[PDB]
């Protein structure tokens, strides 16, 4: 796992980027968002996630909102 | 994105394998399952999925139960 903050998230398109502690921004698709809530994220929201390597490069998997 | 069928899934533990015609089985964790509803899958279930490579190797992402 890794911790980061949502840089931006567009809930109409369903994706955004997560800014991380010392590395490139990580892409985040709505399909990775955990929880029963609507699968959206807010700019600035802290999230815990795992970095996975998808066919277009790095991606967020298992994205959870931290309290 | 591609289709496959659930080979087996352990409901208590929340993981299983997707069998792909002509290819290798793909590990699937409950966290990748899309939809509203309890995150589980039955053997024989047709699914669509993406494949990503994490710290543990290849695994399914964006798993949707298909009819």
From Swiss-Prot, chains A, B:
Induction: In response to low temperature. The keyword Ubl conjugation does not apply. Gene3D superfamilies: 6.20.370.130, Nucleic acid-binding proteins. Residues 4-63 form the CSD domain. It is found in: Cytoplasm. Coiled coil: none annotated. GO terms for molecular function: DNA binding. It holds the Pfam family CSD. InterPro entries: Cold_shock_CspA, Cold_shock_domain, CSD, CSD_CS, CSP_DNA-bd, NA-bd_OB-fold. PROSITE patterns: CSD_1, CSD_2. SUPFAM superfamilies: Nucleic acid-binding proteins. This is Cold shock protein CspB. It comes from Bacillus caldolyticus. The gene is cspB.
């Amino acid at each position: 796992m890794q911790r980061g903050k949502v840089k931006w998230f567009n809930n109409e398109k369903g994706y955004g980027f997560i800014e991380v502690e010392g590395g490139s921004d990580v892409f985040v698709h709505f399909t990775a968002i955990q929880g029963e809530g609507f699968k959206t994220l807010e700019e600035g929201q802290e999230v815990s996630f795992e970095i996975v390597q998808g066919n277009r490069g790095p991606q967020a998997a298992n994205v959870t909102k931290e309290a």
